[model samples]
Target chain A: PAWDETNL
Target chain B: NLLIEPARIEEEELTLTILRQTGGLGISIAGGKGSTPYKGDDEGIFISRVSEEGPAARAGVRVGDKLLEVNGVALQGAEHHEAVEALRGAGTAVQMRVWRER
Candidate 1:
């Protein structure tokens, strides 16, 4: 549950 | 992620205008109203990472920087992915108003 997961 | 190190973390208000090229600004931003506590108190967007060899890193955008605006769009109360989309539609050169904290 994070933006870092995709790092888009 | 390959990250760049700031000389030292400083509390500051910085304005950066990153010109997006063929490879893009090379940055990832996170946080907003639905974000976790670690990201913020559901307030604003933050620079999660600045990839090495990117325009953002070269322009002195470091990890953990909070944003006040992207282009002319306000980030206050913005949804997570909505802000990301705003970032994408910013402009040829994305103008950012950043608040940095150690």
Candidate 2:
């Protein structure tokens, strides 16, 4: 959730 | 997304060390085995994309930039998840080496 969604 | 700019899209090799704060440098990276295709099929991690107006983008990091190192640690041949964890665990500053394909 903290990281960018695109990265996930 | 305020920092995003169509700045120097140089085709060269560069090394940058960016400082990070509580919110992080604001970036996302990709590449590695079974991740993305690379020249010579060698293991390499690339800055697949960057957050608009984020610290990394403000610091000049751009999409398609190949990340060679981070915080003095070489990321060559690293697994995709390994690189992500290393970046996530960085200190106040993140020193990096990046190469852009011409």
Candidate 3:
């Protein structure tokens, strides 16, 4: 189970 | 930023690469990355090992993923080994900042 997250 | 991070690097170093850690290890890679887990590194013993997104993997050649995974997929925490071991697998060159999720 992989979830996508935003990083900046 | 430039034409890079095109897919994501443009956003960030996926968790910034703080050099301080290299300056923190106690010297021990019977198969490991920065001694301290400041940033996690996954051991890619096998290519079949796929990790999830943002798993934090370091590919430093010999050092196996410092941390173990719960899933069968490879961990991204240990991608540094892969980058360093570029062209290791029959001339397989992997770019830097490549993520290998578990």
Candidate 4:
């Protein structure tokens, strides 16, 4: 879970 | 040029105050500062982090808090630059609204 990136 | 991306991403009705200086509000919002998301949209600009000794931390703001407003201005759907400008323009007193998720 990167702060800026969303898995979705 | 600060907070210049959808203002960390949510819209709610809560308010908080933080004393400011040349530094800033001392917090970080979700979404990558305004570029294409590493994930995509719908990822609200929540309070991902707060500086340990900054006004936000001193003001009791914690991570996972969703940013809603800045100085009474609605941030939901607001351009990232708009939120940043509002925050930067917030003079000596900065008021904010956020939602703390459970």
Fraction of the real A/B interface contacts present in each candidate? 0.23, 0.09, 0.00, 0.14
**1 or 2, greater by TM-score:** 1
lDDT of 2 by residue, B3-62 (tens): 777677547888777677667777767557656544345557767667787778777887
Q: Sort by DockQ, best first: what order?
A: 1, 2, 4, 3
Give candidate 1 regions above 4 Å deviation.
A2-8, B1-10, B40-42
lDDT of 3 by residue, B37-58 (tens): 3233433322222222211223
Instruction: Grade the docking of candidate 1.
Output: acceptable
Candidate 2 deviant stretches above 4 angstroms: A1-8, B1-10, B34-43
Sliding window of 10 residues with minimal summed lDDT for model 2 chain B: B34-43
Q: Please state the CAPRI-style docking class of candidate 3.
A: incorrect
Can you list the residue pairs that collide in candidate 4? B4-B80, B4-B81, B5-B80, B6-B80, B8-B45, B9-B45
For model 1, how does the per-residue alpha-carbon lDDT over B1-102 read when each residue is reduced to its tens digit? 999986985589998988787777788877677555336454577787888978898888988888788888878787778877888777788888989887
Per-chain TM-score of candidate 4, chain B: 0.69
> What TM-score, over all chains together, does every model reach?
0.79, 0.72, 0.17, 0.65
Compute the TM-score of each model's chain A versus the native chain A and list the values.
0.19, 0.32, 0.45, 0.37
User: Which is the leading candidate under TM-score?
Assistant: 1
In candidate 1, the residue pairs with backbone N, CA or C atoms under 3 Å apart (3 or more residues apart, or in different chains) clash, namely none
TM-score of the A chain in model 3: 0.45
For model 3, the stretches where C-alpha displacement exceeds 4 angstroms are: A1-8, B1-11, B14-35, B38-74, B77-87, B90-92, B98-102
Instruction: Indicate the fraction of true inter-chain contacts that candidate 1 also forms.
Output: 0.23
TM-score of chain B, candidates 1 onward in order: 0.81, 0.76, 0.17, 0.69
